[PDB]
Design a protein around this ligand. Structure first.
Ligand code: CYC
Ligand code: CYC
Ligand code: CYC
Ligand code: CYC
Ligand code: CYC
Ligand code: CYC
Ligand code: CYC
Ligand code: CYC
Lengths: 174, 63, 91, 73, 161, 160, 160, 161, 161, 160, 160, 161
């Protein structure tokens, strides 16, 4: 559940070394980007259920067959379960951004997830789409509110947790 | 004349333990020896004597 | 397994509260506590009767008591029912 | 019953908070939980009928031991 | 617990006799009132939430209780209060449908007076809320079945007081 | 308070409050006069916040005004206005305590069960806290809106 | 780390970060450069600190370097100062972490069982770490050595 | 539990009022004393073991209690004794750093008088041990912080007596 | 609990002394009676069933108690009755073989009088059943061991009464 | 005591004592007078065991009686020999009991917490009890000091 | 066995064997030759015990060998005496084991469920084992048949 | 589990036979070696600490394992290491004193190789540590008992490998 700080420090535990210039540089970069990360967390904290309903409506208009009798999100019950899960993805991905490390995502979300959705006959493809429909929304809102307070526009740190969960849950086709 | 408390089919139907609620091992309503000897107007000189000697202390024990 | 060997703060068992119970001691306290939960309104678990009375083993009474006080319980009447007191040997 | 149930509410999603720091918390919609057969909870009280004491006690053996050790052996 | 049938087998059993004509008359009485008990339980099952809403609206709201200072002042306390009204209504229906208030002795009244006197739940307001449920419930099930529910709500109010 | 967070967490872990926690205390005691200034400003401006807020809210949803809604007539509008005063009061409590214990323990635990009992739809609560937030942000300073802003957000998160 | 502590905390409460929690993260990430100054100084002065602290240790406590003690001889004294080097490294990790989690989990969890398995008097270890505290407080400012010295104090409280 | 802040929000909440100038003066008082309480809690956290050792050495050892017949005579009872002194020091630190002894009402003084009077723990010796911790602790943290710790150790002593 | 040996180590320990000649005389007394206690416990272990059967047949059956409305009426009550006689016999053997009735204080007579006065178990019929087990048991084990079992059965009868 | 251990056992199994356990009680109550001879000899020779065992302890272990040591001074050395007298008394209790339950509950349950609270090295205590084991084995027969010496061995196993 | 019971006992207590239990093992391993004599005699006299015990069983209890009983017929009587042979074997196992654990786990755990599933009166089985106890006590000495007879008594207490 | 006695009753039981002279010769063998097993278990019980200390000092210290990067490098890992050596010594003593290594099959060696290959514990270093305990333990108990201890330690080493 290590953040960037504890990841660096555990790395220098495996070495046995002390902290050098490289360690202190990587830490200084983390303490610089942290203020920007906090603002992003305030954004998701404001507009969470708006993001969730938007990624919902996008998800179900793109794949209408979920609401068909063959589909998964077909019932009220299955629908509310699906929205529950989207709330999970948004919560833990928010934890990752402040943390700056994707170890929370591995230790508390991703490990045993492929197995669970394989066990319940939940489809993988819809799930992957849902995570990136979250990524695009948070990206857009941060570009607008980025250009208000002027900001560095760059958004790779925001894309990183969602990209990580997409890369994990994705079956390998090359 | 001597009914045996039974909630269902035990006998008469007296609620269990011959009380309003069918429960047992209720919290005790009594207090320690020093407290009951102190509450009454008589035994006041004993409460002073047990106070002086320190056998207040051994009577507070739950043996 | 007497709970007092090798006390924590540097002993690999994470800190836990440790009782003066002797191995297999046979002393118990009659207790009266009251419990209001807290977990219920967000958990929506079925209701249970909070106010009870039981004979708690002496070795583990310590931990049960700390635990009642941690979850806002109120304790009314602690009596030692089962055991004998201030006995240097034989529990 | 339909137009009674359309009237009411979303219900409350069941949160699950873990006292321990390490454990993770997870919510469940109360709609998801109430499908199936509810699993009965056996409660023991000082005042109850001997059926109700016997069922609770026989439920304890099934919980702790994974089988009934009275019916067999 | 026990219903009226169990009670009859209790008396005739505890005498050691068989079932005589009197006990069969009592079983006939219960079996005549059976279907009325059923439809009353059906209607109360249907409209529980409206019973609780209308009874809280009559008895508890717009007073010192929900004003700050009162015991229902916060959301936690409100939710606990209406939760308890739910239990009083459900167990009162069980007591009605059994025809014997032994259920209320076993699974409700036990330890609850100690609990409310422990917390500081006011007895008086609780009793008035239960009587409000008695009036609302009697309005739903009618005269006869409202008399039946009336004896069990009055039983719980006699238990807490 | 923050103090209650730390001491209750240290009681669950059976140890003394650690170094980061006591430094976070010293920062909280350092910022002390600012939050007092905020509760004074939010104390002086209330009738304006509840009027402007309320008129925005009933402008958004007029069904609650309308006969057959929950807020028709005089008394039910008064109750809603009263509720607005209470939420503002709890936000000031969450400011001066610096946490969420006042706000959750007083106004957010079993709030759904209460509103569904009262026949009050809870989406009106959500937009209600939106406009309370907006009027309060209008009366506050520029850093100051960033300080008070997440409290209303979490009250909306209690409402969802 | 405070950020990690904040997470795990609201994660076990199953909620998003609270308004109160975010402010603690702000105070931490603004105090970053100061911490990195401190652990930079104790990093680049480590050789001097290990030596001087070991001199004061062996001069105050002539037990363990006497014949019969644990640390008697060249090889043994070298191992002794090797351990003081370990605890210096761990203290620097706990300074950058803003939390004694690294110090505790690398160095303190089960230390008494290890030094009891080695025959080593752990009070001598605590005296050694106190000597390094005195030297490292001689190398810093007032408030600075208050902070770092209190991390050393944590390690001494774990050894005693 | 509650700190001084929570207690102010309790009184101002239970009046329904907002925070007036008096309550803000109380919060200003606590926020002035905040840092002093922090460093006091830091020092006591550092030297807990030495506080208990010096206080047991002053108050309890080489007397009738650790002689045979006394309540500390065995190693089991010695370890339980010093265990309890640990708890008194830890919760006294929480009470100091909260500024409100309600924690001592909730998590220490509850059921402990019944416990000690049940088992046969002498109250007098306990009180003298707590006062020994008060003197040693005041010697570590200094004058002002020693007065603060002094009101909480005196609170525990007033609880058991 | 404690046997005679543990009691000797309790008195000698709580004085702080070692073992003097008096305590060694008490240990010699126990070690003389050792073998007798063993064979008595062997015989009672052999014939427990017959002791309970003969004692129930003498003391309880064909009376108002097993007639309807008596406490023994119904199978569940009969089996509980003879179950309790089994406990009295077993713990009486433990008390005999330890040479110290502290086990009867710890694990039997605790709360038993409150139990039987709560249920409505007749005390006198219980006592007479225990005395019936005393006569039958003394007839099996003989004179000396019948005296030993006689003091422990009489201890339980003194406990209930 | 062995009898006590034998009971508690079938009491928790809620049965009578087995054949086997009753034979064990027979063997114990027939071995009685030999035990009382052993504890008689260790009773009446206690001063030689405490003195001579203390001499071999302080001669093997010059740490604790050196300056700046736990046993330093006349009163501290007298307290050290006082504790050796305690464990000798408890060993005699364990001999007549035919079980180490007196030794364990009077002396061993929580011993490490006490001597760590006193600053005493408990390995020196175990070396002291081993020295009294050598003296007490010098005062007895072959099989006799095998038995009593094995009670001392139990105390050594609890200290280490 | 006694060794098994002690090892399991201190294993669940997670400690080594106490002095008391090791004395119990010594008394057991020294009582061995006597036990082996007893089980030798009951081994080599089995046909007298089964035959003569079966005769006293069927003569005391003419129920089960009557027409309409369980053991009516040649095959059924042979099976009845077969089971008495089983319990004789198990008693000999319990004698050499020094514990009734062989007897209990081979023969007694769930015996009533079996014979109730076979229609067999288990009181007749207990009378049969008592008859073999009388014959086997007629074949041994005083203390000898006290010991072995008490193993038979355990089996009778398990049947009743 | 099972000792040598139980194993004899298992083979003779599973054949249906009684105990013949071969099985009695095996029980005589166990009862001859009994006291030797007892005193060996007594000495190992006395000096377990020193066995683990000397065996860790011979086998594990001053190598890559306790250097950083190795599996014993931290204090948590050190303490878990010596904890596991304590289990190997204790269960080796149980196996010695039963005379049958079935205990090692049930409670140690089942799943242990999957555990250490899961965690990353080096198996080779573990085996060398166990053999160091074998040499030191044989040095304490002597020749015969060291051969017995040797079979059990070699049994665990054959189990890991
Ligand atoms: C509402 C009409 C009144 C009221 C009620 C109120 N109740 C509580 C707390 C509890 N109530 C119970 C009740 C029951 N438990 C049972 O088993 C049964 C029988 C089925 C009943 C009726 C219990 C156990 C609690 C406490 C814990 C829990 O509920 O899980 C409160 C809470 C008070 C507080 O400070 O915590 C309140 C406020 N309040 C009023 O003013 C009305 C008169
Ligand atoms: C039988 C079990 C079952 C029911 C009943 C059900 C209802 C249901 N209605 C839905 C949406 C909807 N429902 C409506 C309904 C209405 N709009 C109006 O103006 C009318 C007044 C009203 C109908 C009378 C509309 C417009 C939506 C679409 C909302 C959206 O996604 O854009 C959805 C979301 C999925 C989707 O349709 O895209 C569900 C899941 N689902 C179930 O599994
Ligand atoms: C301190 C924490 C706390 C809160 C917040 C609280 C609210 C609360 N709101 C109530 C009613 C109400 N509240 C509202 C509020 C609104 N109507 C709208 O349309 C708007 C969205 C909104 C105003 C912004 C209305 C209309 C009622 C009465 C509804 C009715 O009675 O039909 C009631 C019913 C009885 C009474 O007020 O005395 C309570 C107890 N109680 C508490 O203890
Ligand atoms: C990162 C956490 C960590 C620590 C601290 C650690 C300590 C550690 N200390 C050791 C030895 C030692 N450590 C000491 C230390 C001292 N002697 C004294 O008298 C003084 C009080 C003290 C020095 C201040 C000595 C003498 C030895 C060797 C003792 C011997 O081998 O006989 C060993 C034995 C083998 C080896 O060093 O390679 C380890 C593994 N290992 C770890 O993974
Ligand atoms: C019956 C079970 C039992 C035991 C054993 C026991 C021990 C005990 N040892 C004590 C002190 C002590 N014990 C020692 C012992 C030693 N110093 C060394 O260096 C040696 C290794 C060792 C002697 C062999 C010393 C030095 C003190 C006093 C230390 C001090 O006060 O600074 C004290 C402190 C107060 C007092 O003695 O009255 C107790 C209670 N109490 C009990 O109830
Ligand atoms: C967090 C609040 C709290 C406290 C304080 C607490 C105390 C507490 N003290 C206990 C025993 C005890 N406490 C003492 C204490 C002392 N003996 C003396 O002579 C001295 C005056 C004093 C030490 C300074 C002793 C001797 C016992 C055990 C007495 C016995 O078992 O015979 C027990 C019995 C069982 C157990 O400890 O596990 C509890 C529960 N429990 C709690 O939940
Ligand atoms: C060894 C420890 C121990 C003892 C001794 C013990 C006694 C005991 N006797 C009980 C009931 C009873 N005990 C009796 C006893 C008698 N009725 C008669 O007429 C006779 C005169 C007399 C016996 C000689 C009866 C009839 C009941 C059942 C009352 C009821 O629940 O219906 C109960 C209530 C539980 C139950 O059996 O349903 C306990 C707990 N409990 C223990 O844990
Ligand atoms: C080693 C432990 C053990 C035992 C004891 C055992 C008993 C056993 N007894 C059996 C039958 C039987 N056992 C009896 C015994 C009796 N009839 C009476 O009336 C008398 C009271 C009593 C003789 C003293 C009878 C009659 C049957 C056969 C009944 C039938 O088949 O109808 C059977 C049925 C099949 C078979 O024997 O092969 C088993 C397995 N099995 C075991 O593994």
């Amino acid at each position: 559940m290590q953040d960037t700080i504890a990841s660096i420090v555990n790395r220098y535990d495996c070495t046995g070394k002390y902290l050098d210039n490289v360690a202190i540089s990587e830490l200084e970069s983390y303490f610089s980007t942290a203020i920007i990360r906090l603002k992003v967390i305030e954004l998701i904290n404001q507009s969470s259920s708006k993001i969730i309903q938007e990624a919902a409506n996008r998800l179900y208009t793109e794949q209408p067959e979920l609401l068909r009798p063959g589909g998964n999100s077909y019932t009220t019950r299955r629908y509310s379960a699906c929205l529950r899960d989207i709330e999970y993805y948004l919560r833990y991905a928010s934890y990752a951004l402040i943390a700056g490390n994707t170890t929370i995502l591995s230790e508390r979300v991703l490990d045993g997830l492929k197995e669970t959705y394989s066990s319940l006959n939940v489809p993988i493809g819809p799930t992957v789409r849902s995570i990136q429909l979250l990524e695009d929304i948070i990206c857009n809102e941060f570009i607008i509110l980025a250009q208000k307070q002027n900001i560095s526009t760059n958004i790779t740190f925001i894309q990183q947790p969602f990209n990580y969960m997409v890369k994990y849950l994705s079956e390998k086709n090359i | 004349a001597y009914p045996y408390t039974g909630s269902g089919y035990g006998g008469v139907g007296v609620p269990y333990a011959n009380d309003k609620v069918g429960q047992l091992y209720k919290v005790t309503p009594t207090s320690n020896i020093v407290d009951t000897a102190a509450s009454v107007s008589i035994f006041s000189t004993l409460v002073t004597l047990l106070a002086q000697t320190g056998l207040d202390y051994e009577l507070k024990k739950s043996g | 397994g007497y709970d007092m060997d090798g006390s924590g703060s540097g002993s690999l068992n994470p800190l836990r509260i440790k009782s003066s119970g002797v191995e297999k001691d046979r002393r118990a306290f009659k207790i009266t506590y009251c419990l209001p939960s807290e977990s219920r309104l967000f958990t929506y678990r079925e209701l249970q009767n909070v106010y009870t009375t039981k004979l708690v083993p002496f070795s583990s009474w310590y931990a049960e008591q700390q635990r009642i006080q941690k979850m806002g319980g109120k304790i009314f009447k602690v009596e030692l029912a089962a055991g004998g007191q201030m006995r240097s040997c034989g529990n | 019953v339909i137009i009674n149930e359309f009237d009411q509410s979303r219900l409350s999603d069941k949160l699950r908070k873990r006292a321990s720091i390490d454990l993770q918390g997870l919510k469940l919609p109360q709609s998801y939980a109430m499908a199936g057969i509810l699993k009965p909870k056996f409660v023991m009280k000082s005042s109850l009928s001997a059926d109700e004491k016997n069922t609770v006690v026989k439920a304890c053996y099934r919980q702790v031991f994974e089988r009934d050790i009275a019916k067999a052996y | 617990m026990q219903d009226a049938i169990t009670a009859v087998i209790n008396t005739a059993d505890v005498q050691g006799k068989y079932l005589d004509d009197n006990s069969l008359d009592k079983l006939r009485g219960y079996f005549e009132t059976g279907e009325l008990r059923v439809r009353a339980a059906a209607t109360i099952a249907a409209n529980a939430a409206t019973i609780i809403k209308e009874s809280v609206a009559k008895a508890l709201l717009y007073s010192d209780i929900t004003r700050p200072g009162g015991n229902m002042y916060t959301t936690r306390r409100y939710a606990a209060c209406i939760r308890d009204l739910d239990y009083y209504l459900r167990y009162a229906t069980y007591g009605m449908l059994a025809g014997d208030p032994s259920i209320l002795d076993e699974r409700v009244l036990n330890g609850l007076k100690e609990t409310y006197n422990s917390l500081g739940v006011p007895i008086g307001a609780t009793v008035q809320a239960i009587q409000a449920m008695k009036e609302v419930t009697a309005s739903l099930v009618g005269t006869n079945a409202g008399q039946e529910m009336a004896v069990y709500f009055d039983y719980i109010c006699s238990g807490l007081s | 308070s923050i103090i209650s967070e730390i001491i209750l967490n240290a009681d669950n872990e059976l140890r003394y409050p650690s170094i980061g926690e006591l430094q976070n205390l010293q920062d909280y005691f350092s910022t002390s006069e600012s939050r007092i200034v905020i509760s004074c400003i939010l104390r002086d401006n209330e009738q304006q916040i509840i009027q402007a807020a309320s008129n925005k809210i009933f402008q958004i949803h007029p069904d609650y005004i309308a006969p057959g809604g929950n807020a028709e007539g005089s008394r039910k509008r008064s109750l809603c206005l009263r509720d607005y005063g209470w939420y503002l009061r709890l936000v000031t409590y969450g400011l001066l305590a610096g946490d969420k214990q006042s706000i959750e323990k007083i106004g957010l635990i079993g709030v759904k069960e209460m509103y569904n009992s009262l026949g009050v739809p809870i989406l009106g609560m959500i937009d209600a806290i939106d406009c309370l937030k907006n009027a309060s942000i209008n009366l506050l300073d520029e850093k100051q809106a960033l300080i008070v802003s997440p409290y209303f957000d979490f009250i909306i998160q209690g409402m969802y | 780390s405070i950020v990690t502590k904040s997470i795990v905390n609201a994660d076990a409460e199953a909620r998003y970060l609270s308004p109160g929690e975010l402010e603690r993260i702000k105070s931490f990430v603004l105090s970053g450069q100061r911490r990195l100054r401190i652990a930079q100084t104790l990093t680049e002065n480590r050789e001097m600190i290990v030596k001087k602290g070991g001199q004061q240790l062996f001069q105050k406590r002539t037990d363990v370097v006497s014949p019969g003690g644990n640390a008697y001889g060249e090889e043994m004294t070298a191992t002794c100062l090797r351990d003081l080097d370990y605890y210096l490294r761990l203290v620097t990790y706990g300074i950058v972490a803003g939390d004694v989690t690294p110090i505790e989990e690398i160095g303190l969890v089960g230390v008494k069982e290890m030094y009891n398995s080695l025959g080593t008097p752990i009070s001598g270890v605590s005296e050694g770490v106190r000597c390094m505290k005195d030297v490292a407080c001689s190398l810093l400012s007032g408030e600075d050595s208050a902070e770092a010295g209190f991390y050393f104090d944590y390690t001494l409280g774990a050894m005693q």
